[PDB]
Design a binder for this molecule. Sequence first.
Ligand SMILES: *[C@@H]1O[C@H](CO)[C@@H](O)[C@H](O)[C@H]1NC(C)=O
Ligand SMILES: *[C@@H]1O[C@H](CO)[C@@H](O)[C@H](O)[C@H]1NC(C)=O
Ligand SMILES: *[C@@H]1O[C@H](CO)[C@@H](O)[C@H](O)[C@H]1NC(C)=O
Lengths: 205, 107
Amino acid sequence: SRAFQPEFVESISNVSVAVGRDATFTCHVRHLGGYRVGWLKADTKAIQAIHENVITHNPRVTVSHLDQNTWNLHIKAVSEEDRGGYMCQLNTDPMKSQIGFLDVVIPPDFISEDTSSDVIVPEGSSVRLTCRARGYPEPIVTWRREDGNEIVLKDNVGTKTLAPSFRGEVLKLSKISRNEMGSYLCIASNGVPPSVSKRISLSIH
Amino acid sequence: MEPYFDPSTPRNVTALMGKSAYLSCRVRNLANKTVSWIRHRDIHILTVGSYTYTSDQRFQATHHQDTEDWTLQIKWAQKRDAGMYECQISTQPVRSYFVRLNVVVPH
Ligand SMILES: *[C@@H]1O[C@H](CO)[C@@H](O)[C@H](O)[C@H]1NC(C)=O
Ligand SMILES: *[C@@H]1O[C@H](CO)[C@@H](O)[C@H](O)[C@H]1NC(C)=O
Ligand SMILES: *[C@@H]1O[C@H](CO)[C@@H](O)[C@H](O)[C@H]1NC(C)=O
């Protein structure tokens, strides 16, 4: 026990996890001695913990240390409101602190209110197939024929485009022929597993 | 019922340089929550209940049981100490009560 104060060994890693998974922030120090690692949420200033005492009444927040150099903050089953910066703080004089950031992503999930059901329509008609999705980052919707055939996109002026996939929440089919009947798949994806897919049967009589 | 701050708790305090500064914080229905003092300019945790976190020995929090006042004392007040301070209840999410300290010279 002599006078030289603790130091941070490395920065707090940014963390990015999906809703419901567990997040851990680690504060790497050296020569901590009798000083205490404090944790708080930077944006709300809410105190989380000091040393081994959890101060927040958030039951999902806990702490641990691997050794005297490695102090962890654990946020269990992360939620959207846990998004933000988490400050590691040492009670030295003057105080020293570091901030790491938590990003809360949400896997895609369909909105049942505006996703198309199976539909039977006369030949030559126009049909809107819709699959609205929610998630963070914002999901992109991709349409495919289940049998691998191409989707037929037409304009009003007499030209058709054959694509194996179409990107967009709304698939607009016009002047449809019997050849276009079949099973259409919309897939909502945003890099956050699992992806979600719905099967829509288009019947043309 | 959830804890709350006495709204009569002064939001603007003025101390004298070289003397002790006193920031009050009256809390009702504290139950098993804690009352903490935080200094805003560097988000430095000062006290948690009667426990002292800061290594600046000038600081102390006192629980006035008769009035339910968690008072922060700053000895040897300096101009540098002026600014914004937060009294904070450990509910989820936290309750915060902002208090400004001024440090002036008599007359
Ligand atoms: C963490 O992410 C934020 C953006 O949210 C960025 O400003 C910051 O520099 C990142 N920190 C590190 C250590 O990469
Ligand atoms: C706080 O008190 C000081 C001294 O009494 C005064 O000059 C200042 O205007 C006050 N602040 C507010 C916001 O009233
Ligand atoms: C505080 O009291 C509540 C009462 O329901 C209890 O659930 C909680 O675990 C207590 N927290 C602590 C840290 O004792």
